[PDB]
Write an enzyme that holds these catalytic residues in place. Sequence first.
Site: not given
Ligand SMILES: O[C@@H]1[C@@H](O)[C@H](O)OC[C@H]1O
Length: 206
Positions: A45, A85, A94, A96, A184
């Site tokens: 992530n 975000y 959280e 979006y 992201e």
């Molecule tokens: O919901 C998901 C989230 O949990 C992840 O960390 O990143 C992608 C997102 O779609």
Amino acid sequence: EIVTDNSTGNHDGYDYEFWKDSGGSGTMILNSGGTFSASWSSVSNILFRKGKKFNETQTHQQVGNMSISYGANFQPSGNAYLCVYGWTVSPLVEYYIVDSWGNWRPPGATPKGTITVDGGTYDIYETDRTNQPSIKGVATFSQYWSTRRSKRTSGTISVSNHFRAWESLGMNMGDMYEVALTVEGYQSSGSANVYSNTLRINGNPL
Ligand SMILES: O[C@@H]1[C@@H](O)[C@H](O)OC[C@H]1O
């Protein structure tokens, strides 16, 4: 300037943040105002953003009407989002508003409604994170989503219109923690150049 590790600060009036978990790498370059570029490789992530952080005392109504004009060259190789975000607290949420994505349209849930705004239509969703990373440590919290029906990488995002739409569907928000134009990446690589990003609050730019 150049940011390659988890970091929070203020650049050119905009609160920026670089956030990733372990694995792979990312590079954020902070440009004028709310502009920045982003590259990531083999991440789990990663988030890149510039907007406004709040002191968790006001509702979105009390903050005022929020709107972002943005333009990005968005080049992901895999799963990624170009989005507004942020968070609220009390409740912890959280959220979006996604204008573009990579190989997968998020979030994989049943829509609760739609909002037609800013020349397009968005499906609205609510999902649940159980004991996951959050702005408040490991926590359980909802996610609110507006997801455009067709990809777009520039335009105006009438943030508050989405907020009002969510609340009409019983997706309530708490005190504002943040609002930010965001790139992201999820288990992927790619790059993005946000060449335009202006946050207006009550018609006044940051
Ligand atoms: O919901 C998901 C989230 O949990 C992840 O960390 O990143 C992608 C997102 O779609």
